[PDB]
Design a protein around this motif. Structure first.
Motif, PDB file in Angstrom:
ATOM      1  N   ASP B  16      -4.724 -34.352  18.051  1.00 49.21           N
ATOM      2  CA  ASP B  16      -4.650 -33.626  16.738  1.00 49.21           C
ATOM      3  C   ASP B  16      -4.932 -32.358  16.707  1.00 49.21           C
ATOM      4  OD1 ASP B  16      -3.663 -36.186  15.501  1.00 49.21           O
ATOM      5  OD2 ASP B  16      -5.774 -37.065  15.262  1.00 49.21           O
ATOM      6  N   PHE B  17      -5.001 -31.778  15.434  1.00 46.03           N
ATOM      7  CA  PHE B  17      -5.567 -30.229  15.261  1.00 46.03           C
ATOM      8  C   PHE B  17      -7.068 -29.940  15.706  1.00 46.03           C
ATOM      9  CE2 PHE B  17      -1.235 -30.810  13.240  1.00 46.03           C
ATOM     10  CZ  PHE B  17      -0.599 -29.745  13.547  1.00 46.03           C
ATOM     11  N   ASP B  18      -7.752 -30.908  15.055  1.00 47.85           N
ATOM     12  CA  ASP B  18      -9.138 -30.708  15.230  1.00 47.85           C
ATOM     13  C   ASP B  18      -9.627 -31.100  16.462  1.00 47.85           C
ATOM     14  OD1 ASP B  18      -8.837 -33.621  15.420  1.00 47.85           O
ATOM     15  OD2 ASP B  18     -10.106 -34.160  13.858  1.00 47.85           O
ATOM     16  N   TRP B  36      -2.138 -36.975  11.627  1.00 45.32           N
ATOM     17  CA  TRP B  36      -1.271 -36.065  10.878  1.00 45.32           C
ATOM     18  C   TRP B  36      -0.089 -36.622   9.981  1.00 45.32           C
ATOM     19  CZ3 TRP B  36       3.545 -35.861  13.023  1.00 45.32           C
ATOM     20  CH2 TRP B  36       3.886 -36.378  14.223  1.00 45.32           C
TER      21      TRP B  36
ATOM     22  N   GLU C   8      -3.554 -32.119   5.640  1.00 43.93           N
ATOM     23  CA  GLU C   8      -4.232 -31.059   5.330  1.00 43.93           C
ATOM     24  C   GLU C   8      -4.728 -30.421   6.626  1.00 43.93           C
ATOM     25  OE1 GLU C   8      -7.645 -31.449   2.703  1.00 43.93           O
ATOM     26  OE2 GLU C   8      -8.121 -29.282   2.775  1.00 43.93           O
ATOM     27  N   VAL C   9      -4.470 -29.410   6.901  1.00 40.55           N
ATOM     28  CA  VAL C   9      -4.693 -28.820   8.182  1.00 40.55           C
ATOM     29  C   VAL C   9      -5.686 -27.312   7.723  1.00 40.55           C
ATOM     30  CG1 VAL C   9      -4.100 -27.464  10.263  1.00 40.55           C
ATOM     31  CG2 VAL C   9      -3.080 -29.573   9.508  1.00 40.55           C
ATOM     32  N   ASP C  10      -7.029 -27.259   7.906  1.00 41.85           N
ATOM     33  CA  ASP C  10      -7.784 -25.857   7.641  1.00 41.85           C
ATOM     34  C   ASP C  10      -8.061 -25.190   8.611  1.00 41.85           C
ATOM     35  OD1 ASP C  10      -9.191 -28.045   8.427  1.00 41.85           O
ATOM     36  OD2 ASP C  10     -10.665 -27.891   6.951  1.00 41.85           O
TER      37      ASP C  10
END
Lengths: 431, 54, 54
Positions: B16-18, B36, C8-10
């Motif tokens: 994932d992005f995190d 996501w 949501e991507v922050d």
């Protein structure tokens, strides 16, 4: 620039008139045939009352030639993702039995997952067996149960409607301007009829119209264009094919209702004692929707999207040679007694002679009031009708000739008093 | 048991992005569940046929 | 096919500068495997190294 082309007068057999105090109205009840205009030209019909100034017009403009489809079989489909649950139950606790789990049905309600809710989705109930005893996590030595509540849901946001064609109906977008001034835009194809204000119009003889469409299916998207599939329409949704999960409406796909037709033995199950991985084999519709999206190239017809209504059209070349039928249903046509005189002036002339399209002409109409113009030649072969109003405009229409050196004296009149008018111009020879 | 058709499966470890990683798999044209969203295949030109007699 | 379903991507801008170094470059060209490359990334904060050519 284009206007009336094939302009003829209606017969007195289906046209009656009556005078009731300076206002002489006329009825229309019958069927009449007229030659349809080319691309851009109009199929106007001159209506004569009891005198000469009483002259009306029924403009029927031809936009272009289209090849619409005839929808017969269609269904709603889309992509889905199975969202199954799991709840391991030990033996001799609740409804955990070996004969109950081994003979567990599909649509059989269970007291284990009775707290979620009786939803109206594509749901099913399954059961499995694992291991028992103190070495696994139960009391009795018999193997524990494994209730699985699997229900389908829509994972994406859009949907698709797959339909097919049986014949390419030669649809002609024909708009009709009434006698009062209202413009009604309708369509005609093969032998269908519509409902207008003056009566009803339909298509007589059809020249084109090619078949050969049952071996192809189309895909419609709410806002992502169209597509094409090089495969005939599928009747029953068999297992392992594009279209195994079909519905009836768009809400049945966006909400994944239980009224959708699906094929049995599709949702797999991989029990892992405590874990669970339920997978399917549904074919993604966006793959075929993306590999073959319109416009494409099939044989010799340009497939694209149809204007106005929701359908698939097809572009094809060719001339215009069909006929139109004007069916009246008791329509009243009235006109004033005294009109306003007008003054016409020649502008230019450029087009073709003895051609299907017809040469276009423009005249500088200068009048002080509303009404209509009525002009004709000497032998009564050609006629000119143009709307008149207050001011100086430039009404244009189509005129047909059989000579490149056009030189014919016209007699225009907007109220009964005719005036001479000469036209000129060089045309080209084309079919 | 038996195998009527061999589905080409690709095990993917989606990160994932995190920074959270998730080990999943995709076969033929199936979908899964990630943080996501969902992932699926598009092209699958590999398979073994004729395994009905095994 | 990456199907995003409203996730949501922050991210906070203005990161920390870094300084990388070259190590080696082996592999193949115009191949399905693709050549590999390694860099000696030396930074002081958690982030990413967005590198591009000319």
């Amino acid at each position: 620039d284009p206007g009336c082309s094939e302009l003829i007068q209606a017969s007195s057999r289906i046209t009656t008139c009556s005078t009731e105090g300076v206002n002489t109205k006329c009825r229309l009840s019958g069927t009449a045939l007229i030659r349809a205009g080319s691309v851009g030209a109009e199929a106007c019909l001159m209506l004569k009352g009891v005198k000469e100034d009483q002259t009306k017009f029924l403009k029927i403009k031809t936009v272009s030639s289209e090849l619409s489809c005839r929808e017969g079989q269609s269904y709603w489909t889309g992509s889905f993702s199975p969202k199954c649950l799991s709840s391991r139950r030990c033996h001799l606790v609740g409804e955990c039995h070996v004969n109950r789990c081994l003979s567990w049905r599909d649509n059989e309600t269970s007291a284990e997952f009775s707290f979620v809710g009786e939803s109206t989705t594509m749901r099913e109930n399954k059961c499995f067996e694992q291991c028992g005893g103190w070495g696994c996590g139960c009391f009795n030595v018999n193997p524990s149960c494994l209730f699985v509540h699997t229900y389908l849901q829509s994972v994406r946001k859009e949907a698709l409607r797959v339909f097919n064609c049986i014949d390419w109906v030669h649809k002609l977008t024909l708009e009709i301007t009434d006698f009062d001034g209202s413009v009604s835009t309708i369509d005609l194809g093969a032998s269908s009829s519509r409902f207008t204000n003056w009566g009803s119009v339909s298509l007589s003889l059809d020249a084109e119209g090619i078949s050969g469409s049952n071996s192809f299916s189309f895909i419609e998207s709410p806002g992502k264009g169209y597509a094409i599939v090089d495969e005939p329409f599928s009747e029953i949704p068999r297992q392992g094919f594009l279209g195994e999960i079909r519905c009836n409406s768009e809400s049945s796909v966006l909400s994944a209702h239980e009224s959708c037709l699906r094929a049995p033995n599709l949702i797999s199950y991989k029990p892992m004692i405590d874990q669970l991985e339920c997978t399917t084999n549904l074919i993604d519709p966006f793959v075929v929707f993306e590999r073959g999206s319109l416009p494409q190239t099939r044989n010799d017809k340009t497939f694209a999207a149809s204007k106005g209504n929701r359908g698939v059209q097809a572009f094809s070349k060719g001339s215009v040679q069909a006929d139109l039928t004007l069916m009246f249903d008791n329509f009243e046509v009235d006109f004033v007694g005294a009109a306003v005189s007008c003054d016409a002036a020649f502008l230019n002339l450029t087009g073709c002679y003895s051609c299907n399209a017809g040469a276009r002409v423009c005249l500088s109409i200068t009048s002080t009031g509303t009404g209509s113009l009525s002009a004709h030649n000497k032998d009564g072969s050609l006629h000119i009708v143009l709307p008149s109003e207050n001011g100086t405009k430039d009404q244009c229409q189509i005129l047909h000739f059989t000579v490149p050196e056009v030189e014919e004296e016209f007699m225009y009149s907007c109220d009964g008093d005719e005036r001479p008018l000469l036209v000129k111009g060089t045309l080209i020879a084309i079919d």
